Amino acid sequence: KEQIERAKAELLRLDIHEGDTPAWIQQLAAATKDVWPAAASALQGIGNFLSGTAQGIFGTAFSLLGYLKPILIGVGVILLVILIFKIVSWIP
Amino acid sequence: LSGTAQGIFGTAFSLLGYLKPILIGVGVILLVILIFKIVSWIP
Amino acid sequence: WAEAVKEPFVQVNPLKNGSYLVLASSTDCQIPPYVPSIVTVNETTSCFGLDFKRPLVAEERLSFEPRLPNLQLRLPHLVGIIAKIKGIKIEVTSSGESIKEQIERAKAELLRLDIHEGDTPAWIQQLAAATKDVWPAAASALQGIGNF
Amino acid sequence: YTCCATSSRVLAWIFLVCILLIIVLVSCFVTISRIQWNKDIQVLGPVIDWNVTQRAVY
Amino acid sequence: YTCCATSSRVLAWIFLVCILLIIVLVSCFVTISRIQWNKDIQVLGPVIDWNVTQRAVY
Amino acid sequence: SLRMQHPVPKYVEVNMTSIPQGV
Amino acid sequence: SLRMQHPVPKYVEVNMTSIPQGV
Ligand SMILES: *[C@@H]1O[C@H](CO)[C@@H](O[C@@H]2O[C@H](CO)[C@@H](O[C@@H]3O[C@H](CO[C@H]4O[C@H](CO[C@H]5O[C@H](CO)[C@@H](O)[C@H](O)[C@@H]5O)[C@@H](O)[C@H](O[C@H]5O[C@H](CO)[C@@H](O)[C@H](O)[C@@H]5O[C@H]5O[C@H](CO)[C@@H](O)[C@H](O)[C@@H]5O)[C@@H]4O)[C@@H](O)[C@H](O[C@H]4O[C@H](CO)[C@@H](O)[C@H](O)[C@@H]4O)[C@@H]3O)[C@H](O)[C@H]2NC(C)=O)[C@H](O)[C@H]1NC(C)=O
Ligand SMILES: *[C@@H]1O[C@H](CO)[C@@H](O[C@@H]2O[C@H](CO)[C@@H](O[C@@H]3O[C@H](CO[C@H]4O[C@H](CO)[C@@H](O)[C@H](O[C@H]5O[C@H](CO)[C@@H](O)[C@H](O)[C@@H]5O)[C@@H]4O)[C@@H](O)[C@H](O[C@H]4O[C@H](CO)[C@@H](O)[C@H](O)[C@@H]4O)[C@@H]3O)[C@H](O)[C@H]2NC(C)=O)[C@H](O)[C@H]1NC(C)=O
Ligand SMILES: *[C@@H]1O[C@H](CO)[C@@H](O[C@@H]2O[C@H](CO)[C@@H](O[C@@H]3O[C@H](CO[C@H]4O[C@H](CO)[C@@H](O)[C@H](O)[C@@H]4O)[C@@H](O)[C@H](O)[C@@H]3O)[C@H](O)[C@H]2NC(C)=O)[C@H](O)[C@H]1NC(C)=O
Ligand SMILES: CCCCCCCCCCCCCCCCCCCC(=O)O[C@H](COC(=O)CCCCCCCCCCCCCC)COP(=O)(O)OCCN
Ligand SMILES: *[C@@H]1O[C@H](CO)[C@@H](O[C@@H]2O[C@H](CO)[C@@H](O)[C@H](O)[C@H]2NC(C)=O)[C@H](O)[C@H]1NC(C)=O
Ligand SMILES: *[C@@H]1O[C@H](CO)[C@@H](O[C@@H]2O[C@H](CO)[C@@H](O)[C@H](O)[C@H]2NC(C)=O)[C@H](O)[C@H]1NC(C)=O
Ligand SMILES: *[C@@H]1O[C@H](CO)[C@@H](O[C@@H]2O[C@H](CO)[C@@H](O)[C@H](O)[C@H]2NC(C)=O)[C@H](O)[C@H]1NC(C)=O
Ligand SMILES: *[C@@H]1O[C@H](CO)[C@@H](O[C@@H]2O[C@H](CO)[C@@H](O)[C@H](O)[C@H]2NC(C)=O)[C@H](O)[C@H]1NC(C)=O
Ligand SMILES: CC(C)CCC[C@@H](C)[C@H]1CC[C@H]2[C@@H]3CC=C4C[C@@H](O)CC[C@]4(C)[C@H]3CC[C@]12C
Ligand SMILES: CC(C)CCC[C@@H](C)[C@H]1CC[C@H]2[C@@H]3CC=C4C[C@@H](O)CC[C@]4(C)[C@H]3CC[C@]12C
Ligand SMILES: CC(C)CCC[C@@H](C)[C@H]1CC[C@H]2[C@@H]3CC=C4C[C@@H](O)CC[C@]4(C)[C@H]3CC[C@]12C
C-alpha cells in the first residue's frame, strides 16, 4: 500500500492534452500491454490511425477541435438566446 | 469519503468525476429532442 | 548539460602565462559577452573592477598545445525555461541529436505549464518573452495586456 | 412615458450584448494564447560555436 | 440634360468664388510681408564687448 | 581669464582568442 | 583572432585672455 501511494498523484497529473494525444495514447498502450493485451492492441491501433493514416490529418483535426472548445461553448450559448426569443415570439 | 461505509462515497464521487464528458454529451441530445417536440406542438 | 545561473555573471581567471580567461554576462574593455575568450593587453588597465596587467616578455619554445576540432551546437528555443523549472543541472541534448528528437524531449512537460486563474498576468508575461523573437507584433500586444 | 418603457427595453438589450461579448473576448484570448504557446515550443532554437570574432562589437 | 444645365450653374458659382479668394490671398501676403520687412529693419541689433569669459561653453 | 580641460584621445590594445568546444 | 582598441581618458589645459576693442 505504501509503495503504491508514493507516485500516484504525480502519475495521475500526466493527463491527456490537445497537443500530444497520439504520443499519450502510445504510452497508455505500453502501460496497459501486460495487464490487458486486447485493450493495448486497440489503443495502439487508434494511436497509429491519428499519426499515420493519411498525412496524420485526423490527429491535426482532433488537436485543433480540442483547442477550439472554449469558442464553441461561447457560440452555443448565443444560439439558445436566439432560439428562446424566436420560439416565445411564435406562442399566441 | 475514506472511512464511512466501505469508502463507497469516495468511489461514487471518483467515478462521477471521470464520467463528466459522457454526461454533457447526453444532456445536449435531450435538448435537441425537446426543442423539436416543442416546436412541433406550436400551431 | 544546462543550468540556470544568477545575473550578473562575471568570471575572470588569471592565467599563468599572463593572459586572462573571461566569461561574463556583460561587456567591458571591448570584450564580447556570453562567449568565453583568452584576453591579453599591451598596457595595464582596469576591467570588470580589477587590473589587467601587461605580461612580461617571454622567450619562444616548441609547443605541445592541443588543437581540438570546432563544433556547432543547436539548442531548444526555450532552453532557459527548461533549466529553470528543474532547479538542477539537467541534460538537454546530445552533440549529434536530430531536430525531431531534440523537440519531443520537453514538449509534454512544457505544454502542461498551462494558463491558470491564480497567475494569469505572470503567465502572459512569460508568453510575451517566449513569443518576442518569433512574432514581435504579438509580444508587444501581450506585454500591454499583461501590464493592464 | 413610452420613451421610459422603450428605455427599459433598449437598456436590457445593450446589457445582454455587453455580457455575450465578454464571453466571446475571454474565450478567444484563452484559445489564441494557448496556441501561440504551442507554436513557441516547436520553433528552431539558437546555435553556438565558440567563435569570438563573430561576436565582436565596435 | 437638366443635370448638365444645373451642374453648369452650380459650377460657375464655385469657379467665381475660387478666383475671388485667390485675389484676396495674394493681396494679403504682399501687404503683410512688406510690413514685416519694414518692422525687421527698425528692431534693435546686437552688442559686442570683447569679453571671452562671457562666451565660455562647457 | 578662462581655464579649460580639453579631452585628448588614447588607446589600449586588447587581443582575444577562442576556446573550441569551451575546453 | 580579434584585435581591438579600447579608449582611455586624458586631458590638456588651455588658457584664454581677451583683447579689449580687438586691438
Ligand atoms: C597564454 O596561453 C594561451 C594558450 O593556452 C595562448 O593562446 C593561444 O595562442 C596561440 C598563438 O601562439 C593561438 O594560436 C594561433 O591561432 C590562430 C587562429 O587559429 C584558428 O584560425 C586559423 C585560420 O583559420 C582561417 O583561415 C583558414 C585558411 O588559412 C580557413 O580554413 C578558416 O576557415 C579561417 O578562415 C586555423 O588554421 C586554425 O585551425 C586549427 O585549429 C583549430 C582549433 O583551434 C582546429 O579545428 C583545426 O583543425 C586547426 O588545427 C590543425 O591544423 C593546423 C594547421 O592548419 C595545425 O597547426 C594544428 O596543430 C592542427 O593540426 C584555427 O581555426 C592561428 O592563425 C595562428 O597561426 C600562427 O602560427 C602558424 C604556425 O603555427 C603560422 O603558420 C601562422 O601564419 C600564424 O603565425 C596560431 O596558431 C591559439 O589559438 C591560442 N589558444 C587558444 C585556445 O586561444 C595565449 O595567447 C597565451 N598568452 C600569453 C601572454 O602567452
Ligand atoms: C546535428 O546535425 C543534424 C544534421 O545537420 C541537425 O539536424 C538538421 O538541422 C537542420 C538545420 O536546422 C535541418 O535543416 C532543415 O531541413 C528541412 C528539410 O528536412 C527534410 O529533408 C531532409 C533532407 O536531408 C531530411 O534530413 C529531413 O529529415 C529529418 O526530419 C524528418 C521530418 O521531421 C524526420 O522524419 C527525419 O527522421 C529527419 O529527422 C526532412 O525530411 C528544410 O526544409 C529546412 O529549410 C529551412 O532552412 C533552409 C536553410 O536555412 C532554408 O533555405 C529554407 O528556406 C528553410 O528556412 C532546413 O534545411 C535538418 O532537417 C535537420 N536534420 C535532422 C536529421 O534533424 C541536428 O539538429 C544537429 N544537432 C545538434 C544538437 O546541433
Ligand atoms: C595582439 O596581436 C598582434 C598580432 O596582430 C600582436 O602583434 C605582433 O607582435 C609581435 C611581437 O613579437 C611583433 O613582432 C615585432 O616586430 C618588430 C618589427 O616588425 C617587423 O618584424 C615582424 C617580425 O619580427 C613582422 O611581423 C612585422 O610585420 C615587421 O616586418 C620587431 O622589432 C620586434 O622585435 C618584434 O619581432 C609583430 O610584428 C606583431 N604583428 C602584428 C601583425 O601586429 C600583438 O603583440 C598582440 N597584442 C596583445 C595586446 O596581445
Ligand atoms: C476532402 C479531403 C479530406 C478531408 C478530411 C477531413 C477529416 C476531418 C476529421 C474531423 C475530426 C473531428 C474530431 C473532434 C475532436 C474533439 C476533441 C475535443 C476535446 C479535446 O481535445 O480534449 C482534450 C484532449 O483530448 C483529445 O484530444 C481526445 C480526442 C479523441 C482521440 C481518439 C480519436 C481517434 C479514434 C480512432 C478510431 C479508429 C482507429 C482505427 C481502427 C482534453 O480535454 P480538454 O480540452 O478540456 O483539456 C483538459 C485536459 N484534461
Ligand atoms: C568566425 O567568425 C568570423 C566572423 O564571422 C569568420 O570570419 C570570416 O570568414 C569569411 C569566410 O567564411 C570571410 O569572408 C571573412 O573575411 C571573415 N571575417 C573575419 C572578421 O574574420 C570565421 O570564418 C568564423 N569561423 C572561424 C572558425 O573562425
Ligand atoms: C565678462 O564676462 C563674465 C561672465 O559673464 C563676467 O563675470 C561675471 O560677473 C558677474 C558680476 O557682474 C558675476 O556675478 C559672475 O559670477 C561673473 N562670472 C564669471 C564666470 O566670472 C565679467 O564681469 C565680464 N566683464 C569683464 C570685463 O570681464
Ligand atoms: C598599446 O596599444 C595602443 C593601441 O592603440 C598603442 O597606441 C599607439 O601608440 C603610438 C605611440 O607609440 C601612436 O603613434 C599610435 O598612433 C598608437 N596607435 C595604435 C592603434 O597603436 C599604445 O601606444 C600601446 N602601448 C604599449 C605599452 O604597447
Ligand atoms: C596638461 O594639462 C592636463 C589638464 O587636464 C594635465 O592632466 C593631469 O595629469 C595628471 C598626471 O600627472 C593627472 O593625475 C591629473 O588628474 C590630470 N588632471 C588635471 C586637470 O591636471 C596634464 O598632466 C598636463 N600636462 C602637462 C605636460 O603639463
Ligand atoms: C451564471 C450563468 C449565466 C452561467 C454563466 C456560465 C459561463 C460564465 C461559463 C459556462 C461554461 C464556461 C466555459 C467552460 C470552459 C472553458 C474553457 C477554458 O479553458 C476557458 C474558459 C471557458 C470558455 C469557460 C468560461 C466561462 C463559461 C462560458
Ligand atoms: C459544434 C458547435 C455548435 C459547438 C457546440 C459545443 C460543443 C462542441 C462543446 C460544448 C462543451 C464541450 C465539451 C466540454 C468538456 C469536455 C471534456 C474534454 O476532456 C473532452 C471534450 C469535452 C466533452 C468537450 C467537447 C466539445 C463540447 C461538447
Ligand atoms: C441530465 C443528464 C444528461 C445528466 C447531467 C448531469 C449534470 C447535472 C452534471 C454533469 C457534469 C457536472 C459538472 C461537472 C463539473 C463541475 C465542476 C466542479 O467544480 C463542480 C461541479 C460541476 C459544475 C458539475 C455540476 C453538475 C454537472 C453539470
Within 8 A of F4 by CB-CB distance, chain G residues are: 13-16
Q: Which of C78, C109, C79, C104 is closest to C91 using CA atoms?
A: C79
Three cell numbers at D38?
A: 504551442
Length of chain F (residues)? 23
- Report strand pairing: C10-14 vs F11-17: unpaired
Out of C35, C72, C124, closest to residue D55 by CB: C35
Q: Are C73 and C36 in contact (CB under 8 A)?
A: no
Chain C residue with minimum CA distance to F23? C68
- Is D31 part of the contact surface with chain A (CB cutoff 8 Å)? yes
DSSP H/E element including A63: helix A57-67
Q: Are D43 and F13 in contact (CB under 8 A)?
A: no
In angstroms, the CA C34 to CA C24 distance is 6
Does the beta-carbon distance from D50 to F20 stay under 8 Å? yes
Q: What is the DSSP string of G1-23?
A: -EEEEEE---EEEEEE---GGG-
- Most D CBs within 10 A among F18, F19, F23, hence the mutation to make, goes to F18
Judged by its nearest atom, the ligand closest to the C-alpha of residue E52 is: 6
Q: Which atom of ligand 5 is nearest to the CA of C70?
A: 27
Please give the DSSP secondary-structure letter assigned to residue C25: S
Q: Are A91 and B42 in contact (CB under 8 A)?
A: yes
In angstroms, the CA D12 to CA D8 distance is 6
Q: Which of A31, C79, B6 is closest to D46 using CA atoms?
A: C79
What SS3 state is found at E42? helix
- Is E57 part of the contact surface with chain F (CB cutoff 8 Å)? no
Out of D36, D51, D52, closest to residue C131 by CB: D36
Q: Are D50 and F22 in contact (CB under 8 A)?
A: yes
In angstroms, the CA C145 to CA C118 distance is 16
- Measuring from atom 28 of ligand 6, which residue has the nearest CA? E51
CA–CA min distance E36, chain G (Å) = 34
Count of pairs with CB atoms under 8 A, one residue in C, one in G = 7
- Whole-number Cα distances in Å, C113 to C38, C67, C107, C108, E25: 41, 44, 10, 9, 70
